Amino acid sequence: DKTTFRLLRGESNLFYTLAKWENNKLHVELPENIDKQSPTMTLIYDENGQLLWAQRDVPWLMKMIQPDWLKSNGFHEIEADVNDTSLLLSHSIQQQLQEVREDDDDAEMTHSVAVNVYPATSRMPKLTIVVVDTIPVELKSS
Amino acid sequence: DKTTFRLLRGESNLFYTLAKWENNKLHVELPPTMTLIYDENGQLLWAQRDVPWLMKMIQPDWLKSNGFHEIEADVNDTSLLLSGSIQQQLQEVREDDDDAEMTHSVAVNVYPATSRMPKLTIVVVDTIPVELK
Ligand code: NI
Ligand code: NI
């Protein structure tokens, strides 16, 4: 909750820091195995809500992010089913998800989402960074 | 265990975001943990507190890659990691065995060189021992 919020807001900063504008475009300089260094998903939008960069293409995830949310700092929650939650990681969370599947394969998983607004800068346009924790809330205890 | 590393690596990304390279020197802004920052050759550039016994615990091999480790320490050394709140619990551990051994979680994170910073390795240590919550 509070530690989730802080660690998610902290990952937003890492990506902001590592982001650059070259060739009239946004690029992020990330270590080789970023996906594996953290169980998070990041998206980066402009002041008008247009996607500029996605750690990956995640349809269900992109329809959950209400444009409204991009105009202010916030902590939200989105929902996915076990099947989508598992593609977010596609390692041992997989066994746990199978266990959720054994009792209810239509089970809903809740994911925390941090929205961070960055006012434009001399070397950086106004930007909105969105960070989604990929470990559902129902599996945190483990 | 797992969230332990995630919270330590969060304290690490913080220090990396506040960091700056000016006058050819690393510049660090002040954001239960202790942080140390090293360069590409594995030389210390900054320690949040100078704790000699801890530095000799950070195996140079660990600075090459991101990783999660554990280091042992007696009660005298663990209590030197805080200057002292938790100190009270440390006194009763000491009171029933001055040779008690303490474990501390250690997160190592590597940040590749870029166009605003050179390759760094930030090391974060959980100052509260594993067996004291
Ligand atoms: Ni179904
Ligand atoms: Ni002794």
Structural domains present in chain B: 1-133 (3.30.450.140)
Tokens (6 digits) for B76: 């005298």
- The rounded Å distance from CA B92 to ligand 2 centre is 15
> DSSP string of B57-124?
TS-GGGGGS-EEEEEEEEHHHHHHTT---THHHHHHHHHH-TT-EEEEEEEEEEE---SS---EEEEE
CA A141 to chain centroid, in Å, comes to 20
- Beta-carbon separation of A14 and B9 below 8 A: no
**Contact (CB, 8 A) for A116 and A128:** yes
User: Which residues make Cβ contacts (< 8 Å) with residue A98, sequence separation at least 6?
Assistant: none
Q: Which residues pair with B110 in a beta bridge?
A: B121
How far apart (Å, rounded) are the C-alpha atoms in residues A10 and A42? 12
Minimum-distance CB partner of B13 among A11, A39, A140? A11
**Contact (CB, 8 A) for B100 and B74:** yes
Query: What count of other Cβ atoms lies within 10 Å of the Cβ of residue A132?
Result: 24
- The tokens 């190592």 sit on which residue? B108
Q: Which residues pair with A27 in a beta bridge?
A: A20
Phi-psi category of residue B115: left, alpha or beta, with phi > 0 → left and psi -120 to 50 → alpha? alpha
- Beta-carbon separation of B10 and A13 below 8 A: no
- Read off φ and ψ for residue A78, nearest 5 degrees: -120, 165
Using CA atoms, how far residue B97 sits from A44, B74, B84, B88, B121, in Å, is: 54, 10, 20, 15, 36
Query: Where is B13: in which H helix or E strand?
Result: helix B3-18
- Beta-carbon separation of A6 and B3 below 8 A: no
Q: Work out the burial of residue B125: count CB atoms within 10 Å of its CB; fewer than 13 is exposed, 13-18 middle, 19 or more buried.
A: buried
Collapse the DSSP code of A110 into the 3-class scheme (helix H, G, I; strand E, B; otherwise coil) and give the result. strand
Task: Consult the annotation and say whether B99 binds a ligand.
Answer: yes
- Edge to edge, the sheet with strand A51-54 lists A51-54, A40-46, A127-133, A108-118, A74-81
Look at chain A and count its residues.
142
Give this entry's resolution in angstroms. Answer: 2.5
Task: Consult the annotation and say whether A81 binds a ligand.
Answer: no
How far apart (Å, rounded) are the C-alpha atoms in residues B7 and A133? 13
Collapse the DSSP code of A31 into the 3-class scheme (helix H, G, I; strand E, B; otherwise coil) and give the result. coil
Query: What count of other Cβ atoms lies within 10 Å of the Cβ of residue A58?
Result: 18
Q: Work out the burial of residue B70: count CB atoms within 10 Å of its CB; fewer than 13 is exposed, 13-18 middle, 19 or more buried.
A: exposed
**Contact (CB, 8 A) for A117 and A128:** yes
Residue of A nearest to B67 (CA): A37
Q: Which residues pair with A23 in a beta bridge?
A: none
- The tokens 């009270």 sit on which residue? B88
What does DSSP assign to residue B46? E
How far apart (Å, rounded) are the C-alpha atoms in residues B68 and B27? 26
